Amino acid sequence: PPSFDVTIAPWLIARSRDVLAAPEMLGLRDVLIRSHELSDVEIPLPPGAAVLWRILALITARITGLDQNPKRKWQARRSQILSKGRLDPEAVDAYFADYSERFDLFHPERPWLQDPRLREECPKTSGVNKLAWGRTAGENQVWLGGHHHDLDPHPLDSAEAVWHLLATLGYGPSGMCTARVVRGRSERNVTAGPLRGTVSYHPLGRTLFESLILNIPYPGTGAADLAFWEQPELNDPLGLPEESAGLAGILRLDHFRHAVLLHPSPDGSHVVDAWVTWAWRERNISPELDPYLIYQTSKEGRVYPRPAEAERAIWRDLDALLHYGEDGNYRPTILDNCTPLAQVPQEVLDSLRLRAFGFDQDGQARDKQWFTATTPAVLDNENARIVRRITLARKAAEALGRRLEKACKEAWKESNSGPWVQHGMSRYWAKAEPVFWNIVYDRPAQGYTPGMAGPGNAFNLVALAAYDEVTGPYCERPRVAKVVERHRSTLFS
Amino acid sequence: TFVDIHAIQTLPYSNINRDDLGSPKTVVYGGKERTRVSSQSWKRAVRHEVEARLGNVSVNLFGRMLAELPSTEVDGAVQFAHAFTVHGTTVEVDFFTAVDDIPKENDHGSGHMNAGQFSAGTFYRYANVNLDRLVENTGDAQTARTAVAEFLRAFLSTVPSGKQNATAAMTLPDLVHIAVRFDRPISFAPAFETALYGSDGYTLRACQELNNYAERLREVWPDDAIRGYATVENKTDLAALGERYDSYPALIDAMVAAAF
Amino acid sequence: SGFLLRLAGPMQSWGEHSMFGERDTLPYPSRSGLIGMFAAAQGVRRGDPLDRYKELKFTVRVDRPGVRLVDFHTIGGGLPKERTVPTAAGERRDPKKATIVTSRSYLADAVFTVAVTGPEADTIADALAAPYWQPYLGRRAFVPDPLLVLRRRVADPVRELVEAVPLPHRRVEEDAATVLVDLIYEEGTLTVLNDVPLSFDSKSRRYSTRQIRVVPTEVPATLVAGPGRDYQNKLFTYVKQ
DNA sequence: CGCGGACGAAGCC
DNA sequence: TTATCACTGGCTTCGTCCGCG
Numbered sequence A: 001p002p003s004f005d006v007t008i009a010p011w012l013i014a015r016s017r018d019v020l021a022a023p024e025m026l027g028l029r030d031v032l033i034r035s036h037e038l039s040d041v042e043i044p045l046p047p048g049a050a051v052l053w054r055i056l057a058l059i060t061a062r063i064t065g066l067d068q069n070p071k072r073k074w075q076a077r078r079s080q081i082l083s084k085g086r087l088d089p090e091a092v093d094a095y096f097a098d099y100s101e102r103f104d105l106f107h108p109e110r111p112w113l114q115d116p117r118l119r120e121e122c123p124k125t126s127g128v129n130k131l132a133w134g135r136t137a138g139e140n141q142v143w144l145g146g147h148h149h150d151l152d153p154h155p156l157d158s159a160e161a162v163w164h165l166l167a168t169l170g171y172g173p174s175g176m177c178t179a180r181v182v183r184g185r186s187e188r189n190v191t192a193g194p195l196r197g198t199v200s201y202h203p204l205g206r207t208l209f210e211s212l213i214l215n216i217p218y219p220g221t222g223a224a225d226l227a228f229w230e231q232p233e234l235n236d237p238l239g240l241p242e243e244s245a246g247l248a249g250i251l252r253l254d255h256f257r258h259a260v261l262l263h264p265s266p267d268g269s270h271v272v273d274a275w276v277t278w279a280w281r282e283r284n285i286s287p288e289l290d291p292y293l294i295y296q297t298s299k300e301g302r303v304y305p306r307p308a309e310a311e312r313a314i315w316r317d318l319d320a321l322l323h324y325g326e327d328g329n330y331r332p333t334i335l336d337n338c339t340p341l342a343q344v345p346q347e348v349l350d351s352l353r354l355r356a357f358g359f360d361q362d363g364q365a366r367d368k369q370w371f372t373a374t375t376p377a378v379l380d381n382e383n384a385r386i387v388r389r390i391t392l393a394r395k396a397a398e399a400l401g402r403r404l405e406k407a408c409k410e411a412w413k414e415s416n417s418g419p420w421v422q423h424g425m426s427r428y429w430a431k432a433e434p435v436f437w438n439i440v441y442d443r444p445a446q447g448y449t450p451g452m453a454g455p456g457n458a459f460n461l462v463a464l465a466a467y468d469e470v471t472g473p474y475c476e477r478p479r480v481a482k483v484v485e486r487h488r489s490t491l492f493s
Numbered sequence B: 001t002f003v004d005i006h007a008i009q010t011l012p013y014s015n016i017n018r019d020d021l022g023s024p025k026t027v028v029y030g031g032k033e034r035t036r037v038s039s040q041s042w043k044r045a046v047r048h049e050v051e052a053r054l055g056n057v058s059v060n061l062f063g064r065m066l067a068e069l070p071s072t073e074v075d076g077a078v079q080f081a082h083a084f085t086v087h088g089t090t091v092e093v094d095f096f097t098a099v100d101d102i103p104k105e106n107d108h109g110s111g112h113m114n115a116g117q118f119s120a121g122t123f124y125r126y127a128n129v130n131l132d133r134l135v136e137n138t139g140d141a142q143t144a145r146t147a148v149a150e151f152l153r154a155f156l157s158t159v160p161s162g163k164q165n166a167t168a169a170m171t172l173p174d175l176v177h178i179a180v181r182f183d184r185p186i187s188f189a190p191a192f193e194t195a196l197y198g199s200d201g202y203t204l205r206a207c208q209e210l211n212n213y214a215e216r217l218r219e220v221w222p223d224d225a226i227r228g229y230a231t232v233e234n235k236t237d238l239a240a241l242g243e244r245y246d247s248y249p250a251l252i253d254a255m256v257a258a259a260f
Numbered sequence C: 001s002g003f004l005l006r007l008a009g010p011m012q013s014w015g016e017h018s019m020f021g022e023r024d025t026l027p028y029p030s031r032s033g034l035i036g037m038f039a040a041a042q043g044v045r046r047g048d049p050l051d052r053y054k055e056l057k058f059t060v061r062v063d064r065p066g067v068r069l070v071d072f073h074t075i076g077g078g079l080p081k082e083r084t085v086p087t088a089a090g091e092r093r094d095p096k097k098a099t100i101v102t103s104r105s106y107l108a109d110a111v112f113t114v115a116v117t118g119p120e121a122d123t124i125a126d127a128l129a130a131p132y133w134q135p136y137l138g139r140r141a142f143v144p145d146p147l148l149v150l151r152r153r154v155a156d157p158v159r160e161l162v163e164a165v166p167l168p169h170r171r172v173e174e175d176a177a178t179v180l181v182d183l184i185y186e187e188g189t190l191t192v193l194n195d196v197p198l199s200f201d202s203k204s205r206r207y208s209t210r211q212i213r214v215v216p217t218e219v220p221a222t223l224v225a226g227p228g229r230d231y232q233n234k235l236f237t238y239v240k241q
Numbered sequence D: 001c002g003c004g005g006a007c008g009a010a011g012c013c
Numbered sequence E: 001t002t003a004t005c006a007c008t009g010g011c012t013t014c015g016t017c018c019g020c021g
Helices: A028-033 A046-063 A070-084 A089-096 A158-170 A208-215 A315-320 A333-338 A381-416 A419-440 A458-474 A478-492 B039-053 B057-061 B131-138 B141-157 B203-220 B248-259 C031-042 C121-129 C157-162 C230-240
Strands: A012-016 A024-026 A038-042 A199-204 A258-264 A270-278 A295-298 A302-305 A353-361 A367-373 B002-014 B026-029 B032-037 B078-085 B092-098 B112-130 B175-181 B228-231 C003-005 C057-064 C067-075 C100-108 C111-117 C149-151 C179-185 C190-199 C206-219
Touching: A012 A028, A028 A046, A028 A089, A038 A208, A046 A089, A046 A158, A046 A199, A046 A208, A046 A353, A046 A367, A070 A208, A158 A258, A158 A270, A199 A208, A199 A333, A315 A381, A315 A419, A381 A419, A381 A458, A381 A478, A419 A458, A419 C067, A458 A478, B002 B131, B002 B141, B002 B203, B026 B078, B026 C067, B026 C100, B032 B112, B039 B057, B039 B078, B039 B141, B057 B131, B057 B141, B112 B131, B112 B141, B112 B203, B131 B141, B141 B248, B175 B203, B175 B248, B203 C230, B228 B248, C003 C121, C003 C157, C031 C121, C031 C190, C057 C157, C111 C121, C111 C157, C121 C149, C149 C230
Parallel strands: none
Antiparallel strands: A012 A024, A012 A038, A199 A353, A258 A270, A295 A302, A353 A367, B002 B112, B002 B175, B026 B032, B032 B078, B078 B112, B092 B112, B175 B228, C003 C111, C003 C149, C057 C111, C057 C179, C067 C100, C179 C206, C190 C206
């Protein structure tokens, strides 16, 4: 019979902090056990990883450190585990000992992260090409990402199938898909992924161990909860997705909006067909903000995670990752709990370094770009001053930058009574990141004064240099020169 | 054996291809922005003349039919470089207004005010074709003859169709240089990495500049490359480019003959 | 063994991590790209073991960083529905929706000098001199500068990029020296990116991560060339000797 | 009467 | 001095309706 154990069968790429040669593929158990020896384990799809780090954080929280002066007891228990440096393998095999038969992805009953009843009531298989990302599904245009005619498709290996699976449970097309009659009701319509189009932020250490431990969000006191893959019950598609105060409900793993089924190859080496289909009809609000994402409120008062953006340079978001101030956005709770000195770790904070997964795509089923971003290491009153410099910097920076946008745009119009904005921003941000990074490290940057609280209008000189680099050849005819300079004067501040 | 062609085709005030906005595509090169016509656009035009004139050498010479499913040969052994202007070019805005024919008891409140961008210049075009893969894939050497000869003349004659009804950009290349090279393909693009200065025209000056670059590269690498070039001017000699030919089809004939 | 490559030309684009309509290039050459170009020069069919190319080293000096531009790039627009790009289902979509709109990015006016150092790099140079398929910088449409290989054979090429290879014109203050140039080392800011190509098979191209270290280095100001047309002369002078 | 082609149903404010 | 300032599209599966043969 086809079987594929996630704990045993290798699928997580792993490079240790040692040797730094030949990264080896490991299963989930072997990875989770040798965490202290390996530096990191990765998968090529940032969405897949964006949910992966959630799965590992939840699992290691359920093994150690759940439910629970609750705050001081959590930070104390937290301090012991961070100081000890190694989880005992017997508690991992004891945590898996409760769900030993449940981690098969092709299990006859209760398949991993799947719905077994979906195989019936679904006359047409979606196909591997409809599940995996970057693979042209049935009606898509075939042009890019390898041509796949949806006729005799080469079956994915199971590991990559797990990656694309995790992606679909996270980000998933909100469009209508294959229909499933459930007790007479067939609405082939499918909802959107729970965190579709946001960049997840997981902090890192020197190995996966302490990183995964800092990944654990603080569970507020409430009802004990359990994940979708930890549910003894098989979900009923109709009804309300009941709320969940437990950490498995705020780690977005209590139930996923989509539902995938993978048809196994006789050996279990490949996936041959797939079914992606709706699991719930009426959408309900999930309690509490996702600790990983940066939230932000725009007029109308809507609290929403800032949608990723391929165009934006990442560094500005990193500034938001800091607070005790509020710059118009709510922000991320895990970062707030995890990194300030009120917490408890002594030194790991000095060497921790933040990582970002951002899959920016349509509000529908269209997709444009994903990206990872292992940004350096960043961390009271003295610290408050360093953050204050960072804010007053990112502020002056984008503010004058967009003012240069309006400038360029308007300029070209009033001239002609625009091609300048695109190239303007390209050189601008490309030239602007290193100047910012010099400001944060308090290094000397021309037009900027080291160790002065004020911004120093350095970005004025950068934007002016970029502006002249773009508009140079068109300040030629006297009229256009008049408009272009009279709008360049505004960047002088 | 690679046969590559360099041309210095000029285009009057035109907007053959354009961005998502109205402005033409531009490559900032040598510190000076310079208009370009992307490679795929000109290549698609070439594909239509070659296939029209031929009445599967098109899936061989060019990579793969756009409307056909991949037939295990997606590559083509033809490499079109993006044409770019020899000199720096400011995008020249053309303000235009659509006229309303029926007139009310008011005057001239025209139908549509707008401004569209256009540009003109002497594009340095370039392409190479890998004969060896073409022979190995097509089989018959004569099919290779018609494919390369007919492809070459097509390379010269065609011009993309974009905003052409408003601007008649039809033209013939001023300089063509086909160099049958056995070592490796070489583009003379860096000859124009320093945009030429203006006010007197560029055809002659660009010709002689390309001559200097050909002289020097041939100096660094003396080779058995069979060369030849044809121009619409008889006033200036370009010894580095090979023997002169009276006309373009004569040249193409001599070089296809030279390949076999 | 080892030799100096110069990745130059009007436009280049060493993209990665983009698998949809928008393509994007890294501001730095990637290892996958250069390995694939050498593989094209040697006739490595798509899917053949590329392990031979493993064990190579790529120190890359950025002369001019260049300005990256967004090339708008539609495919199939303006053609009758009957001849448009096929569907996976097989039915051409309606002509009002049949045009694909890719927005491919590319680096323009950027020049890097990668110093490939390895065990057999001399044979790959022997292949660049007479390539099996045309080498290109990222997208095949981009055509390499004729000076693709500055020196066929060099003992310790990184030392020769650190000095004695000209660089493009930049501000040289009076009585100044030691102009800053960013070298990119593989081992010893920094970024993590998916480059090292495990396989080039068109059916399932897969990669693994390679750490890239960005080292601001100090090179003699004498290398910087004069403002106009001297740079080509200096490069050629270097190439012959 | 059969077949082919085209538009709509959301998800979304 | 006054009037004028375009559209269209590059999402998802399938079903139904309509035009055709």
